[PDB]
Amino acid sequence: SSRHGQKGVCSRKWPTIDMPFSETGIQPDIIINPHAFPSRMTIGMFVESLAGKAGALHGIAQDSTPWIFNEDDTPADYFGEQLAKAGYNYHGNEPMYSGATGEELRADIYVGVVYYQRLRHMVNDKFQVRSTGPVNSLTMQPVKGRKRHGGIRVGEMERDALIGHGTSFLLQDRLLNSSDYTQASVCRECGSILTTQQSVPRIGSISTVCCRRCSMRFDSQIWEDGQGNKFVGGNETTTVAIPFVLKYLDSELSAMGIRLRYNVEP
Amino acid sequence: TGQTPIVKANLYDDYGMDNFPNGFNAVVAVISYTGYDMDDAMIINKSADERGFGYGT
Amino acid sequence: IFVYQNNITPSAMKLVPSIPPATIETFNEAALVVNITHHELVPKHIRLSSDEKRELLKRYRLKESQLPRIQRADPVALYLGLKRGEVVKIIRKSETSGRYASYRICM
Amino acid sequence: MDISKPVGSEITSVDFGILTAKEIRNLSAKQITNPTVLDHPVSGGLYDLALGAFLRNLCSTCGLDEKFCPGHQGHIELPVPCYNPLFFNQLYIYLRASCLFCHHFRLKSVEVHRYACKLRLLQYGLIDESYKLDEITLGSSSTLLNELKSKRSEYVDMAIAKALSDGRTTERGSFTATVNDERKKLVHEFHKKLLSRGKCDNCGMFSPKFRKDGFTKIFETALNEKQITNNRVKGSTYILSTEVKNILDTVFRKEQCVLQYVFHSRPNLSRKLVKADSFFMDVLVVPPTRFRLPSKLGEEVHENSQNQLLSKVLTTSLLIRDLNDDLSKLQKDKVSLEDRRVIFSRLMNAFVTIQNDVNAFIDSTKAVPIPGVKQALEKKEGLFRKHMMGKRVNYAARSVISPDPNIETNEIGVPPVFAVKLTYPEPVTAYNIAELRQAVINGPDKWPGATQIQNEDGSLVSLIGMSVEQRKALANQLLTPSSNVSTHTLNKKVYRHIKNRDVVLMNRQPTLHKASMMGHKVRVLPNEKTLRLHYANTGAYNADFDGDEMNMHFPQNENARAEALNLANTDSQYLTPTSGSPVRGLIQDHISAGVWLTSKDSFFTREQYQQYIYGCIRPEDGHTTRSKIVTLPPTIFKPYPLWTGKQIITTVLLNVTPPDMPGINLISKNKIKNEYWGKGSLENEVLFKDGALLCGILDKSQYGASKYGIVHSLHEVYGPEVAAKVLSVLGRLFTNYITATAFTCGMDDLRLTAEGNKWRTDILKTSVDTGREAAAEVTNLDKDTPADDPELLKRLQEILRDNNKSGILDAVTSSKVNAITSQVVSKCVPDGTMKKFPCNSMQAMALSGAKGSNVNVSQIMCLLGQQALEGRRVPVMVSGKTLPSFKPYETDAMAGGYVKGRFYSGIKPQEYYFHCMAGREGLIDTAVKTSRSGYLQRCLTKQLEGVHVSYDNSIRDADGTLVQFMYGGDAIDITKESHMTQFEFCLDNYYALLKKYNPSALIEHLDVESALKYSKKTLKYRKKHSKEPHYKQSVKYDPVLAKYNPAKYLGSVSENFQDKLESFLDKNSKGVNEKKFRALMQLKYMRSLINPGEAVGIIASQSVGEPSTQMNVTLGIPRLREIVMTASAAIKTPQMTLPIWNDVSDEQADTFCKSISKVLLSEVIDKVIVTETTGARSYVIHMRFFDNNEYSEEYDVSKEELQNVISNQFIHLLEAAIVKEIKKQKRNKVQRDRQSAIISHHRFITKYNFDDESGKWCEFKLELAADTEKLLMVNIVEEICRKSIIRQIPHIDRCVHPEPENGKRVLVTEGVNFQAMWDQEAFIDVDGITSNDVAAVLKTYGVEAARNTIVNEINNVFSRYAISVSFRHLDLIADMMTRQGTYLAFNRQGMETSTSSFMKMSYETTCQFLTKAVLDNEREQLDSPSARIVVGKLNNVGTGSFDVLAKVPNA
């Protein structure tokens, strides 16, 4: 930024050969678009460019304290007199040449010397990319934090916009498939996702998925527990695809004494 | 590397801001030439940047 | 149809709906000095018959509950003497499509 | 989501229910007893190994580690049942209004049966039956009541059987929004009827009352002595949890009949009895260790808050159990009662403590406080709005955005830092190993490469820590036959990098509309750490390049790829759905470059012309449709060839526009007049002909976001792809041109000439006295009065004291000085400028629309003008000085803020101060406005998120409720409505339009005669009629859109489109005949229809929310709040407009306004003199009025009416106020007859009179007792004079006669009372009166008048700020609001009547809607989008509106 609020990021490091060169052989080190000026109306930057060039030529320092000029004694007049005396033109325009083609440009370019400040808002503390990483403990969603390999949040307004496109698959991929997708187990009859468990096996058997709500204390349909509580019960469970935050919400509601039956279709 | 401004108020010396140079003087052309600096972006000469222009730690 | 100049005692209102299938509708000398269907904001309401209502429900594969609802007590339903369960027809003067046909059910 | 592991099952619906104590005791793994968590986990503690694996301790339930243990619930046995905090209000309401003796409700049993029957009917879609049951009143004592109840039961059974037989309802019941409203109203009235009872009706046994003190505590009061008198003929206290449980258990098991229907919204198949044990918590279920793991932050180890609250509950439970053993000692042994009394009081205190501990574990507002389980799911930070309605996502990125014009307008520039981390699962095949094997050989580091290779069995091998030879070996074994039979139907995946063919989704917060999130194409650039974005997307994203940053989401399946490349992609969103206007295009440098290139002054040699053409267009990249660049003959042949910039535009179009099509024929204008090019120029009139720019200059109006420019026309005629290509090609062209002929601005652009400066000085010299003249006019002083006249200074002092007079003075002075400013600028621009257009780059930017405006140019070059602060001038201190520099009451424009200074020459210190004031105000306003309109969008979108377009072409909510029968009345897509009334454009481009529409393939699939015949009949009938009003006309013919589907029958169009088409064809007869043109236009109408599955509700909400940020009756966001956010019945400024008869003169209209507007008594009072004498404490309240010939003229109030109001209402109110204050302090014979009458009628009036010949005084003596203290008798008299009205009509505050705008002569009154203006038919067109108040018009005119009022008002907020919102959005909003016949709102109040409760609980007040949904056992079928994302199912709107089936070739 300059001292007039004309902030702006740097797009590309333009090579000096492709930079436009003036008739005196000097290529500017900062290029600012002329379209930044008409809306802001920072004419002080133009006056500073004029006075900076004049002072650099004459070896003097130009004071820019406000209200040292008036309508009769214009800074444009003053610094233009200095530039014309130094041999450059009154209006601060320099005939420049295209650095890529070589021909002289249509009109004289406005050049000068202005004081520039570098701000601490650098892109090296802004960029962040996540493919996988540390997930949360209860929601099993990506953690928050640039330094933690954490993901970004697609929130309420982003979801509403993603619906407005009619792209329900974009919504699925954002909010479920890439955030907390899980292939849990659900009881067909109980309709509950949490009261199921992986039964411990016996010698040679294979662990299966059972349920505790639709089971009563006690050969083929006998499944045991780690703590020795063997009993026959729910042997009819499926695997649906749900967000894990749904399972956390189910646990929280069960803490409130509320039940949610999940009616599995087939 | 900071520089004392060519254009500075008379109060710049009184508060001794020369002891703390904030930025640098640069040759700035108000030109629409690159096409990469339209909205508010700006273009920095690569050779100047390769001579320690605006460098900081 | 009954009118009352100033007021009606509340006790004479608990027995009007007590003689089916005939119905009694009560209006006032006030609120009737201007026909509220002559107002440009108010569209033309047409009471849909049974056959047309069945055709409408079959056309849209609807249920009588899912239709837009007109209250039993708003002035237009009182004006038409509308009954619960019977659909009305509204010809709306949409500024994007001119005449436009929409239906409300009375529930 | 891996696509190689399909899921067979699916959650159809979820129904809320109550977890009983028996099942949780059955399902639990272990009981938690001691309140010690760790010593290692405490066996029997909260972290017991039966509740899940914990820190390498294998779970003792399933025997699996922390990864494979889902976590299991445990339970803690409460020694006593506890009041569930969620259901306590219902517990209390049912405890009240009951008989402890007969164990029935205190309501009549027959009335309870009636409510039960009505609820049983409402369980089915039988609203009419449940209201025809009311007319079975007996009719048709105990035996009679039993027969009546049997009759009602049989009537209900027969009605339900008939409904089930005839199809209106199945055995599951028909639950919709209106039946839900009826059920809620019935249950509310049932409860209200119950609670409003004093004595039991089955047995007249008075029951003790109850009182409430928050929670955990319920007490009963004893009957009074007169109340127990009835209790003596029928023959305070702390109640216990078990006592109230027994009471309600008895009541519920007796009234199961009504309860099975009160606690149900749909019939229950299992017929499970509703029990009172469901309202009490005798067991608490503890969440598993997985969900209660400790919150460890390095060395900062913290205990979980849930563990804290559960441990407190455990401590109180164990304390109660121990207290239950020593109390047994003081009961079995015959010990004294004092120690027993102490132990019993301690036990009661412990009961209260355990109840409060349970209430703390459940909620935190009933027990700084530890957040319970309710607070985790309550607000914006709660579980719903922060983890289900918004989530963190894998495979996404964020960075700062930098511009790039050498990238496609539909592309994004992704740095190599992102391009190596982001990855996509590409399954290997026999056609893909060419590139995937190469990527694997490249490895994770060399772009493009593969980070991982997912095996068939789901194994995810990583190539990061692997050598090149091993990567080559893996890539060689990448495509191998599966050795395992169980995994022979799968192929290996490759997590290859994000190539150029991949698609990405961008987003910049805040996402105010769907255009702010598009699907761009990926272009992997070689420089790092910034996202490269073309300049066309700046308008779409509202983005910038001064530090703005935006997200980059990477879809992971081909479904989302197709969705992003086709539906969400960049070039298919050229037009905003808000108003159909374009939103893409070039901005500043390209606009100025085009203005310079497309002038007559531009000539180019053969080599220059060819270089520009090949720079912009590159056939090897696919930019050319002819495979070979084709050029034009030069416009000059001798002395040497010379082309023109317009020829470059023509060649660009010639090479990018597809061949075998005619060129664009467009006639338009630009922003630069013909006086900016000289005398006789015609460069303002753009002219295309066969795709050849023959006249005019290309401007902002042609390329950019402007309707009916060349880019918009190219879009319409050649599809979106060609317009995107033209934007890219013009961007490259105007970039390469601006390099060789660069554009610049400088100091000489900002200078005036000597003559311009002398003009400015001469005009500004006339501004010295304008402030003084305006002040003299405002203060009603004759002109030519000195600026320091004492009377002028006194008047200015009064104006300074009075805010309204200050505002008037500010307005007048601002008007005069703004007139002077306009004089200066119009004189000195551009005539007085030194450097002129097009050389003057400042004016070039201003006129061209690249940047800035004439306002900015004028401020830089002529003057700054008046500084306006809060709609006024600069503030003035209490001394009359607006600044220390200016003397008090300085009548000068510069003092008040008129800056006669320009940014070229600088402003004085005072003007600098004033300009800083104005700039600070502007910054504050922008900061407020950036988010003042953020709640409205979410309030709308929560309810409208499901409203979509069905295949019936009727828009209807997610459950199925119909909102509109046809979108906007015509089903026309707003993004396609642009070139439909552009009949001249369509006629000019007829052949290309025919080529694009191809009616050759659109005949065998359409009916092209029936719709046309019906439309001809309808048009003939309408032309015969329509000279008669809308009510009198008989319809006899519905519009063609009603009968015939517009998307299947050619010729079925809206009445407005058909009228416009016929008017065009009749008004201009112009070689193609009218028949084929009409056929083409009707086919265009057919093809401009809104597709089934459109998210019209979301689109309407976004298009009424986002434009709101661009912002004597409330305007903007406050008015949008009043209308669509809360639907207030009492608005801040209720007005109704009154049309006038054309035979009523303006004098008569003004007289009517005066005679209708209210007039208080205080508005004719001059002064009041109260001569209080205590010589028994009297008052002589002399009233002074204005002259009669003054107040009668001003208000139309005469002596008789004044005397009447004073005698009747004023004196009465004065007596009332006097007596109220007294009670507060304790803690001509006709005139004689009138006086005596007033004395007799009023309390303590002793004398009375009136100026019966002039109406000038009203002096009456008042008297009071001597014992009373002193009264002010001035303040109360003033308040009474303010209160008492002379002539008012109810609710009308003031009727005024505004200037006739739009030709019609209208009156506006403050306050709405329709039935009061119906009586003034002699002056008012009574059938044309409309009002601001939607509620009043809804009440006195009906639902549809309210609908029209809502639409007109919600349009009037935008149209005052020159914002265009399509009426389809507003019509959809209003038809969603009045969808029940009432003026509902967009909030939680209007949300209650809704099928899905997931939507409401995600919206807000989650606890309340959860209790309501669990009491009624509500079962929502997962219809609303919110429920779908809560349960993680594919949404219904858009691409989820249908299903995809595969046609296998074998049965």
Add this chain to the structure above:
Amino acid sequence: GPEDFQQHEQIRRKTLKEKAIPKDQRATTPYMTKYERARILGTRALQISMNAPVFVDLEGETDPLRIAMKELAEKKIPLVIRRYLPDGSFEDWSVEELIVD
């Protein structure tokens, strides 16, 4: 048991048949909507990327979405769009039966 499942299956299939709308009386758009085109392209791309048999001749391309677009151009997509009416009724339009734009 087996008979209870048999009657459940019969009720389900009867409801399905009662919801289906025969080809001779469907009153939906003859065209293919943009959502239908996008989802049919995505699903066909998924299928072909999952090693499905292909009908069109590959021109050296390897993008499954591009191959699906080629098939849609050649009308060789063996898929059916089941357009659901609000009440659960459905019309089974075929990809070749529909006219793309």
Add this chain to the structure above:
RNA sequence: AUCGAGAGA
């Protein structure tokens, strides 16, 4: 983890 200060659009 919570509440305080500040910063970017």
Add this chain to the structure above:
DNA sequence: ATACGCTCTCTGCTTATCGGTAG
């Protein structure tokens, strides 16, 4: 000396005590 028991915002819905009308 140390471990462990603990005073300066906007809406809209819901409740309370005074008015009548009627058997």
Add this chain to the structure above:
DNA sequence: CTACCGATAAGCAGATCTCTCGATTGCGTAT
């Protein structure tokens, strides 16, 4: 002559894009 239903004064529940850094319970008590 009292029960029931309105009807205004009072009480009570609730939302209004990203990112850094800094700070974190008071006494008491029995040896």
